[PDB]
Symmetry: C2
Subunit: 325 residues, 2 copies
């Protein structure tokens, strides 16, 4: 058992940190990316210099260029591509996977048609074992072997046990959660809230203001969760509160960093280019905002961020309207 | 509605900041301190240099060193002393209470004997109208007039109305909350968690580990709240989550800096001497630990902090036992 290789699709910081966690335990890992130049860098250097420098790949970790090749002999797939590319990657996997394929993901966000990612998986690939991994997990700290805890929700007990067996260790811990819907929804909203708190911090509004915004953030996250059938227990757990407090308060949080630039008057284009990766917060804002309108759900922080990005709303004015009811 | 002066007992940073919020709106405020040389300093200088320097008093804010004098002609009182001094202050107020006295407090933590603050107030002074104000509110940021939001819970609708009317405003916002007990209990645990998360940071265990500990912290805070009849809505609100995130992540938190020192290897005695002014987290830990044990309440973080303080438990081992959970 646990001899079959595992494929991880997406070589951003988190996909790579997860590949490392597994590869270090001697498990064979195949790391694929649709960015060909990046794969060339990884194959040539044996490290992921553009997203996670200073952490060489162990021997059991190899970068792949060809999706088919990375999945040959693999039954368990862990997807960590950006939310905007999830549907496209699933579509590409459709004729490559087989009957016993099991699908997990660490991607956070919604897909076209305002759908939770598991629905995209189900529609395209049929009813298969599925799992979502999510919690407070800065990729650099995981890479550095600092203590970390995440939640894992699945529709299949054996798959959940198997994933936990692969990942769960002394310093990287994975706890079962039976609420996939709630884990997905909390994960799709937390980056949006971190942009908002980043904006507040950029405006130098203070620690008190940030704490208030975080509290209001969890309230709207909670509303979204309840409307779709998630559990309030998820809200106060690692996938909700945990990931939210980390992402809204840490200097290593890129979504917060982006918000902070906006708060300091940097335009969104220049702000993203300066950061250099994928600010999921931008994509998540649009995804969640559309879902909230489709279902007429009140989500004030999310709505203000969306106005800031698409209607030239002044950051100062935006935050002021939020704190002052 | 503000013909009469309001008295604020406790001239620490927070008490003084609250006094400024009110006095700046033109309300008459009397600020009392039990440190007598302290009132002389404030009367002479027109500022609280010991605890909130750089924020001069408006004309309507006056310091008093006599408790009786501060309460003469005043029926609304707002207590903001440390939890370890609450009992003493309530005791001294006994001969000064009148028929319409109303008592609010900004103090956080259990009083002597592991007593809830409203119980000390009700048992010792009678069942007077009571209220608690609690939320993420660094005193320095409030003095600077930066946006702040806090909860206010009361056992009397008229008192709630009157307090919110006095305090609520543009940058300092006060939201009605129906759960005094939940608000109190949340506030009595947050500094214990600040010490715990401070220790993890002192050990440089990282931001992921801190978030995991904050998450676990809220779980035991919820258990305590639940056992005394408080509400989950309070737990995820300003008095629970809000104040917890602020206190577990800020440089300004003295309880967190104390924890940082412990995590770095400093002994508790030297760590507190270096800080200088008394902190409440150790006292809070001891009172809550006693309460948890009296009622068989499981609170793992609080118990580990207690072990670190009183059983010589090594900090690294302590945090690794907390994180390496089943």
């Amino acid at each position: 058992p646990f001899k079959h290789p595992i494929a991880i699709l997406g070589a951003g910081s988190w996909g790579t940190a997860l590949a490392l966690v597994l590869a270090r335990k001697g498990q064979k890992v195949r790391l694929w990316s649709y960015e060909s130049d990046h794969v060339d860098e990884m194959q040539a250097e044996g490290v992921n210099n553009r997203y996670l420098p200073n952490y060489p790949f162990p021997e059991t970790l190899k970068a792949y260029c060809d999706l088919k090749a990375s999945l040959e002999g693999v039954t368990d797939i862990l997807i960590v591509v950006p939310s905007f590319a999830f549907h496209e990657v699933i579509t590409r996997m459709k004729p490559l996977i087989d009957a016993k394929t099991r699908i997990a993901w660490g991607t956070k966000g919604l897909a076209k048609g305002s759908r939770l990612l598991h629905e995209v998986v189900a529609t395209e690939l049929g009813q298969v074992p599925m799992a979502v991994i999510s919690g407070p997990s800065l990729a650099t700290e995981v890479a550095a072997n600092l203590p970390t805890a995440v939640s894992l929700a699945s529709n299949n007990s054996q798959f959940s046990k198997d994933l936990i067996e692969r990942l769960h260790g002394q310093r990287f811990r994975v706890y079962k959660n039976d609420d996939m819907i709630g884990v997905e929804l909390c994960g799709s909203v937390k980056n949006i809230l971190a942009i908002a708190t980043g904006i507040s911090d950029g405006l130098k509004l203070g620690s008190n203001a940030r704490a208030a915004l975080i509290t209001r953030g969890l309230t709207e996250m909670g509303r979204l969760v309840s409307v779709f059938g998630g559990k309030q227990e998820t809200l106060t757990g690692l996938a909700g509160l945990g990931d939210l407090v980390l992402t809204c308060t840490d200097n290593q949080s890129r979504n917060r960093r982006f918000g902070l630039a906006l708060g300091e008057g940097v335009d969104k284009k220049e702000a993203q280019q300066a950061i250099g990766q994928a600010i999921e917060g931008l994509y998540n804002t649009d995804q969640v905002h559309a879902l909230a309108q489709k279902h007429a759900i009140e989500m004030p922080l999310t709505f203000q961020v969306h106005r800031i990005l698409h209607e030239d709303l002044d950051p100062q004015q935006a935050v002021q309207e939020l704190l002052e009811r």
